[PDB]
């Protein structure tokens, strides 16, 4: 599963129908000069995708129709068309399309052009494995900064979310709440068996009242009935072993809760410094627990370890991206949105970041923009934003004009 | 420990109810053995994170909700026609 092509119209700068060409399965690099509507690009996928911008405020939903120039827009849509080969969206197609579409007072998706649900979109990802409790399908600074300047109980609400007691606390009580509704009809169950049975007490003895001398079709169907019977008694059975099955699960989930919380911090630290080491080569991260109360995090760039607080500016930086690297290796998805998450750290650790996509695109895709040629290095396939009458166009260009594209250009920090 | 086996395995359909029950057929629920899926859930080959688990236990009692609306549905049924076949 992977995102196989885009399409966009009238969403922010994207007056017209831009049919962006198929991404590469590996890593697709998007370069441009400010301000030409590369995170426009993001957003539009984030509209399809991500569930922040599930709900949308009529004020909300106009702003993102293209206000540029001439004949203003009064209606926009995005397409995302997924490779579904490996069957990882429960949609028996190789393709899957997914458009959301926003007018005035239309906000309308469309799976394979016939209309679903806000809820069924998010089903629909959700048994992919994109999991609302997992805040880095897409990265942008925003998220670098805010993981870096968060307390550390923040820290630890997110982990423990991403660990998933929110998700099981949820669905445990829907559960709950599911299987007292279904306690009330195995009574209404048991009753009708109880009311049948009377009445094949009553035929039978109706039956043995005439075979010593009430319609003959119940009298002639006495046995189909009582066979009828046991084919209920049996999947009635069946229920209760289920019953019996669901009340031992509940009970061993709540048994391992912890454990199994504690075994996802165990390997998201563990992932910490094993990311942190691979992108600065001789240099020491962990995760800690605090007084739980909060996850800090302890580095040293060198045997005497700084917390995140007293750290520099673009280390800060890279070491809240080993972290989220790290939550998601340990969370992995198929695809991956990164906008300029290079755009804090020095040549240096922009190169090691660079080293480690290159790694992960054999195994995700990879959608990313920069205004600094490391990752280019580590690209598949590249496109420019062209902005020209405050309309945003988006073209494959090869990796030459991209590597000279950003080298003089000026337009950027 | 998160996504197990991209599915179509024994806890497919378990993994189905938890998210998109839409999709999820009578014949599913019929043939869906709650014990067995109960059993590869408590003890799978690789342990699964609690929001996994957190997951597949509402499938498990989705299922065993649609079993129980049926067989009340052909109960009610059985019910009415052994009361008709009388008439």
């Keep these: ?413 | 420990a998160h996504f197990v086996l991209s599915k179509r395995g024994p806890l497919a359909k378990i993994w189905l109810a938890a998210h998109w029950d839409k999709k999820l057929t009578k014949a599913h629920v019929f043939e869906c053995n709650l014990e067995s899926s109960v059993e590869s859930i408590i003890s799978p080959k690789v342990k699964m994170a609690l929001r996994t688990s957190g997951h597949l236990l509402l499938g498990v009692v989705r299922i065993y909700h649609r079993k129980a609306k049926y067989l009340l549905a052909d109960c009610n049924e059985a019910f009415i026609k052994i009361k008709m076949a009388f008439r």
């Design chain 1, 1 to 413: 599963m992977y995102i196989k092509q885009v399409i966009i119209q009238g969403f922010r700068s994207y007056r017209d129908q831009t049919i962006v060409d198929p991404f590469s399965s590996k890593h697709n690099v998007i370069v441009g000069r400010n301000g030409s509507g590369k995170s426009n690009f993001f957003y539009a996928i984030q509209f399809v995708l991500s569930d922040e911008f599930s709900h949308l405020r009529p004020e909300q939903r106009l702003a993102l129709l293209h206000e540029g120039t001439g004949p203003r827009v009064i209606s926009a849509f995005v397409e995302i068309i997924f490779d579904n080969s490996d069957n990882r969206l429960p949609i028996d197609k190789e393709e899957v399309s997914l458009r959301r579409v926003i007018g005035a007072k239309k906000d309308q998706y469309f799976l394979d052009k016939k209309m679903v649900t806000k809820n069924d979109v998010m089903n629909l990802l959700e048994s992919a494995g994109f999991s609302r409790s997992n805040p880095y399908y897409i990265v942008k600074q925003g998220k670098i900064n805010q993981m870096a300047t968060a307390p550390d109980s923040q820290r630890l609400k997110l982990l423990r979310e991403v660990a998933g007691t929110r998700v099981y606390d949820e669905r445990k009580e829907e559960s709950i709440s599911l299987m007292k509704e279904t306690e009330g009809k195995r009574e209404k169950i048991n009753e009708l068996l109880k009311y049948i049975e009377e009445r094949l007490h009553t035929l039978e003895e109706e039956k043995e009242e005439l075979a010593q001398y009430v319609n003959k079709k119940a009298l002639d169907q006495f046995v189909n009935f009582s066979e009828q019977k046991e084919k209920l008694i049996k999947r009635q059975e069946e229920l209760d072993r289920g019953y019996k099955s669901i009340m031992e699960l509940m009970n061993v989930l709540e048994l391992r809760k912890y454990e199994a919380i504690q075994l996802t911090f165990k390997q998201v630290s563990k992932n910490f410094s094993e990311v942190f080491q691979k992108l600065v080569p001789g240099g020491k991260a962990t995760l800690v627990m605090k007084k739980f109360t909060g996850v800090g995090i302890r580095v040293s760039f060198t045997g005497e370890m700084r917390e995140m607080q007293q750290l520099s500016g673009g280390q800060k930086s890279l070491v809240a991206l080993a972290l989220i690297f790290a939550i998601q290796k340990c969370d992995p998805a198929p695809f991956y949105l990164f906008d300029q998450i290079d755009q804090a750290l020095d040549a240096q650790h922009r190169k090691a970041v660079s080293d480690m996509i290159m790694e992960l695109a054999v195994h995700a895709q990879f959608i990313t923009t920069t205004f600094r040629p490391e990752l280019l290095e580590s690209a598949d396939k590249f496109y420019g934003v062209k902005f020209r009458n405050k309309v945003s166009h988006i073209d494959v260009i090869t990796a030459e004009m991209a590597k000279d594209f950003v080298e003089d250009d000026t337009t950027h920090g």
